[PDB]
Amino acid sequence: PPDLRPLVPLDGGRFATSDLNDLYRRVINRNNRLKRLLDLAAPDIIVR
């Protein structure tokens, strides 16, 4: 749940991002890239 990984509102408009959010973003980006490359029918080594 988002509250267990809250975004602390900092002064000046910046937001403090927890490590869990960064890891989730990395996983989501990697999954989306893999799906896009699978759609494009990439060679075996690239998809592996």
Partner 1 sequence: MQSWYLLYCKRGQLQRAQEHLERQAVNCLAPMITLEKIVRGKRTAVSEPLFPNYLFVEFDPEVIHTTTINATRGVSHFVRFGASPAIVPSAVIHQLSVYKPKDIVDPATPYPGDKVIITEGAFEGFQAIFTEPDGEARSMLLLNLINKEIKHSVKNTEFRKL
Partner DNA sequence: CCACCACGCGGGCGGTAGCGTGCTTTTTTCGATCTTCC
Partner DNA sequence: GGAAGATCGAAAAAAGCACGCTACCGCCCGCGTGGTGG
User: Is 14 one of the binding residues for DNA (CB under 7 A)?
Assistant: yes
> How far, CA to CA in Å, does 40 sit from each of 26, 35, 36, 37, 46?
21, 9, 6, 5, 11
Q: What are the residues whose beta carbons fall under 8 Å from the beta carbon of 18, sequence distance 6 or more?
A: 5, 6, 7
User: Is 23 one of the binding residues for RNA (CB under 7 A)?
Assistant: no
For partner 1, give the closer residue by CB, 10 or 45: 45
Q: Which stretch binds RNA (CB under 7 A): 4-12, 26-34, 36-44?
A: 4-12
9 binds, among RNA, partner 1, DNA, none (CB under 5 to 8 A by kind): RNA
